Amino acid sequence: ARASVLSGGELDKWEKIRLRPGGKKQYKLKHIVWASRELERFAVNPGLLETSEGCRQILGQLQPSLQTGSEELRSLYNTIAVLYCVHQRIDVKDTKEALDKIEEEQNKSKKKAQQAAADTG
Amino acid sequence: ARASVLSGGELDKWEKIRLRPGGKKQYKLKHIVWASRELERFAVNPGLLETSEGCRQILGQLQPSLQTGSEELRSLYNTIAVLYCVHQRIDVKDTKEALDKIEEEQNKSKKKAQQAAADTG
Amino acid sequence: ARASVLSGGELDKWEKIRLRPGGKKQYKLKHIVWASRELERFAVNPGLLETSEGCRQILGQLQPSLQTGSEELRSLYNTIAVLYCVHQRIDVKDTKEALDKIEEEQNKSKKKAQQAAADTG
Numbered sequence: 001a002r003a004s005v006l007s008g009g010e011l012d013k014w015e016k017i018r019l020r021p022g023g024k025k026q027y028k029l030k031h032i033v034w035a036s037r038e039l040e041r042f043a044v045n046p047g048l049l050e051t052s053e054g055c056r057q058i059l060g061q062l063q064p065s066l067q068t069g070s071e072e073l074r075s076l077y078n079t080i081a082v083l084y085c086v087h088q089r090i091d092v093k094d095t096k097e098a099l100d101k102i103e104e105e106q107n108k109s110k111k112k113a114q115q116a117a118a119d120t121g
Numbered sequence: 122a123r124a125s126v127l128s129g130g131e132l133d134k135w136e137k138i139r140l141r142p143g144g145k146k147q148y149k150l151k152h153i154v155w156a157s158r159e160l161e162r163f164a165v166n167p168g169l170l171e172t173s174e175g176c177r178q179i180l181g182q183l184q185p186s187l188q189t190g191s192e193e194l195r196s197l198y199n200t201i202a203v204l205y206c207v208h209q210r211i212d213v214k215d216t217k218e219a220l221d222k223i224e225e226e227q228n229k230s231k232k233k234a235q236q237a238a239a240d241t242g
Numbered sequence: 243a244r245a246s247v248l249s250g251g252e253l254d255k256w257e258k259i260r261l262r263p264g265g266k267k268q269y270k271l272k273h274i275v276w277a278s279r280e281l282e283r284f285a286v287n288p289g290l291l292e293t294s295e296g297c298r299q300i301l302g303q304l305q306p307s308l309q310t311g312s313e314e315l316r317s318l319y320n321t322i323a324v325l326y327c328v329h330q331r332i333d334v335k336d337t338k339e340a341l342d343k344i345e346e347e348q349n350k351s352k353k354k355a356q357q358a359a360a361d362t363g
């Protein structure tokens with residue numbers, strides 16, 4: 001799943017985002033196929049990774065087994081978290097820098113989703 | 122797992138259920154055998170399929186992973202939804218007519234259950 | 243995982259516990275490594291087996307898939323339920339005595355955890 005989830009542009013910053021913040025050589029194509037083929041190992045439609053919404057619901061489905069899940073499953077969840085921010089063309093140097101973006105997004109949605117329920121009236 | 126889930130009679134209608142409405146192929150023995158070696162893979166006791174209730178909750182167990190599930194997870198959930206209707210001896214032409222059965226059945230119970238609740242009172 | 247999950251002390255009572263209450267075969271070391279290799283297969287972090295809290299959550303993570311789970315999952319859940327009491331140095335004869343009192347543990351907290359709710363104020 002190389003030419004299906006990362007276009008010519010999104011595939012540049014991906015290989016530029018190093019695995020861990022205080023770490024060297026960045027993400028690679030083996031991770032997208034690893035995450036994709038790992039998604040069938042856990043029975044989750046890999047096609048959702050192609051969109052900016054499938055990667056968002058996959059994270060939700062993965063959060064249940066977050067604090068007790070395995071370590072490689074954490075890498076799977078982390079890789080998708082980056083791909084999510086990747087599809088949005090966000091500024092991200094390493095992995096941890098992206099999850100805080102997602103961690104920042106949760107409140108933003110609630111800060112604005114709840115800003116809509118009260119916006120009426 | 123062939124002489125246990127579907128009896129000689131219940132298997133009669135099973136062999137006729139078309140896999141797809143706009144298709145011709147109908148169910149077979151492998152579709153329940155494959156289903157057998159699919160829930161054990163996903164840590165689910167297959168014996169539940171034998172009963173008319175062991176299939177009404179396996180689907181409830183798979184509904185969470187349905188909207189984001191893989192392809193075989195969909196076909197797996199398909200085979201059980203039909204087996205439930207079979208254990209009810211309900212006349213279902215193809216897969217779709219059975220898929221709507223459960224959804225047409227959810228409100229059915231809830232309609233009279235809630236009514237039965239309000240009926241007491 | 244043989245020299246990490248259970249210390250020299252708690253590694254003895256495990257050897258004393260027989261598989262079934264009215265049975266003979268007792269627990270061994272292949273049940274912890276097997277349980278370790280299994281939760282690994284289930285995207286579960288094995289390290290939590292080494293603490294009195296790492297297994298309290300694994301049980302909760304497995305409680306949902308209990309009523310419809312497989313038998314080797316039935317055995318896997320039973321293994322951690324026993325080693326949990328092992329990490330508590332509780333006196334349990336067989337696998338059932340621990341299971342019976344594991345469900346004897348939630349309400350006791352709620353018994354006085356809800357007490358503190360009214361004890362405060």
Ligand SMILES: O=P(O)(O)O[C@H]1[C@H](OP(=O)(O)O)[C@H](OP(=O)(O)O)[C@@H](OP(=O)(O)O)[C@@H](OP(=O)(O)O)[C@H]1OP(=O)(O)O
Pocket residue numbers: 016
């Ligand atoms: O490792 P280097 O070849 O010395 O250059 C790296 C990095 O290289 P890669 O990300 O491709 O591995 C960037 O990419 P290149 O220009 O070398 O292709 C480069 O410049 P860009 O980031 O603009 O692409 C620069 O990063 P930056 O310019 O943001 O500082 C950074 O140089 P350092 O080795 O000094 O970190």
Ligand SMILES: O=P(O)(O)O[C@H]1[C@H](OP(=O)(O)O)[C@H](OP(=O)(O)O)[C@@H](OP(=O)(O)O)[C@@H](OP(=O)(O)O)[C@H]1OP(=O)(O)O
Pocket residue numbers: 234237238239240241242
């Ligand atoms: O006596 P009914 O008005 O016919 O209701 C009874 C029953 O009543 P009691 O158990 O209190 O005698 C339950 O009462 P409510 O829930 O409506 O208050 C009700 O629902 P539940 O049992 O789910 O609580 C349902 O029982 P069941 O759902 O098991 O069939 C059953 O109503 P029906 O006699 O119409 O079936």
Ligand SMILES: O=P(O)(O)O[C@H]1[C@H](OP(=O)(O)O)[C@H](OP(=O)(O)O)[C@@H](OP(=O)(O)O)[C@@H](OP(=O)(O)O)[C@H]1OP(=O)(O)O
Pocket residue numbers: 257258
């Ligand atoms: O099997 P036995 O050698 O006959 O002894 C067993 C048991 O041994 P197991 O670990 O093999 O089950 C205990 O330990 P050991 O005799 O092997 O040292 C022993 O004493 P402890 O339980 O205090 O260790 C006692 O168990 P209990 O007194 O709780 O019944 C019980 O003896 P019997 O099976 O012969 O009654």
